[PDB]
Design a protein around this ligand. Structure first.
Ligand SMILES: *C/C=C(C)/C=C/C=C(C)/C=C/C1=C(C)CCCC1(C)C
Ligand SMILES: *C/C=C(C)/C=C/C=C(C)/C=C/C1=C(C)CCCC1(C)C
Ligand SMILES: *C/C=C(C)/C=C/C=C(C)/C=C/C1=C(C)CCCC1(C)C
Lengths: 210, 210, 210
């Protein structure tokens, strides 16, 4: 298309598409639970990447800046599902799952608001609050066979989720240090790893079984 | 009102209104669970039909085409609740419920996107993806007293849910073969049967009891 | 800011901010569950109050009337969480929780629609329907150590939730008897009490423990 970042968006679409199908066929045939959640994640990401590529999930924000809003719609559902996998994995109580999913909702809802805000400076305010929520989620993940995989995914989550605020911050969504074309690439590479990459470790693992 | 399809919208409102109340009084007095879910469904449909009739749930989409977006808001909640009844009925695991509700969310979210897309051809793309999700839900319903009712509702679901993609496809939302006035009528007749019609079979049945 | 009601919005922000933190530190360290839900509530309210104050959660509605839509986004999540605390407290079945949360969703969704409607008279129609849903929730709360606290919070809920329809009705959202500046103050005072005020009674109580 007429947009440089189309190929990354096309790439995200295919890669997320391929993973859903792969996860879909592997799942035939707790494990069920883990397959259910883990397949939904790239499946949802797949529709939002397609929406971004076709231009539906793109809007213009004055502060006129092109903002792909559709990833927040993605992240609103797929990140709590990712937390649930982890939660599942270690039999998290309902208190902690609730806490996590709530902070997650706050993390993404405020990121969206930051994304769509029309006063430049206020954007970072929302960035920080959202970061605070991320840091709480990461904190819960750390302080409160299976315990081996969990440590893996937890490390993966930490390294991958901590990259998003940075990319948004320096990217076209934030201070505009790095152009849209490049922050779209970074998000795609994070997203494929955080979801497809995350999925294979979990799903290729016997930790998911009773 | 100045719109031909007002009477179908008025009709949906009343019929969905009447059912909520009927379900509401019958429910006094697992069964509770089945009454809770089953009454919410026309209750929600009732507010969205009212919203369409008063014109709040109507918008214009260039590709300028009048689109009733409010039914997606309806379907986003009422179709997963319908799946839950079924799930309930056969003690579905949490894996399968999750799978179903996720594909359902994808089914409606993509339908909405198709509904609001401004490139004609892309609309059908979203139609197909949404159809794919429907076909997966229908597949789960089939392959994985009470077992008698369930077969009934399952047949009902299959016959009624399979009609929606067709009406959207040939209707004013899709190729525009059939005018808005008529696709509004078809959706109303499907909606009343899928919810009120569905509700009576389930609720007049002893399968709902322990 | 240039808006009279900024100070109430600033006040809501701080007070809701302070409560989240307070609840956050107290929670370290069923109880977990009660802390999880109860801290999320002002935490969410905190972001929406901030959004209103910075102007993101404010819009203009013709019928041109300034409408703070962001509180519905707040109430959509925080009021069902408040109901859940109560539900928790008395071991409500899943049927009743579902019923309550569904009517709650209807209560707020219709209030929002009323809030955004462009035909003056229709607004009250949506007001009434939303009120009907409130009255059903209040009805469930009444007709179907711990039983002592519960009665307290239930009384509190009843007195505080019943005030919202009145303020909306006479306020700038409704008939415009009382100016925006004043209905913003009333909502803030209700919100802080319904959430922070509600939280302390519950959280300072041993009813939350096994
Ligand atoms: C499947 C997609 C994933 C795992 C996305 C995760 C995204 C985040 C951890 C988001 C973080 C952000 C902040 C904490 C600050 C504001 C910018 C965000 C929303 C990118
Ligand atoms: C209470 C309302 C019900 C049962 C509605 C169900 C609607 C569907 C099964 C929707 C299907 C659609 C597709 C699968 C393709 C795109 C068009 C839709 C959204 C009508
Ligand atoms: C944390 C905020 C709370 C407890 C808000 C509760 C708000 C309501 C009980 C809302 C009620 C309303 C009606 C029943 C009629 C229409 C106007 C509303 C939405 C304010």
């Amino acid at each position: 298309t007429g947009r440089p970042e189309w190929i990354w968006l096309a790439l995200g679409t295919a890669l997320m598409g391929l993973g859903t199908l792969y996860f879909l066929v592997k799942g035939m045939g707790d494990a069920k639970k883990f397959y259910a959640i883990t397949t939904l994640v790239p499946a949802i990401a797949f529709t939002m990447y397609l929406s971004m590529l076709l231009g539906y999930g793109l809007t213009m924000v004055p502060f006129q800046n092109p903002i792909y809003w559709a990833r927040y719609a993605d992240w609103l559902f797929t990140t709590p599902l990712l937390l649930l996998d982890l939660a599942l994995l270690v039999d998290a109580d309902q208190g902690t799952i609730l806490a996590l999913v709530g902070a997650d909702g706050i993390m993404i809802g405020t990121g969206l608001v930051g994304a769509l805000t029309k006063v430049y400076s206020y954007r970072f305010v929302w960035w920080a609050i959202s970061t605070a929520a991320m840091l709480y989620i990461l904190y819960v993940l750390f302080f409160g066979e299976v315990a081996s995989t969990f440590k893996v995914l937890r490390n993966v989550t930490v390294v991958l989720w901590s990259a998003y605020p940075v990319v948004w911050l320096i990217g076209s969504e934030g201070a505009g240090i790095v152009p849209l074309n490049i922050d779209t690439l970074l998000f795609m590479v994070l997203d494929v790893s955080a979801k497809v990459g995350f999925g294979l470790i979990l799903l290729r693992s016997r930790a998911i079984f009773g």
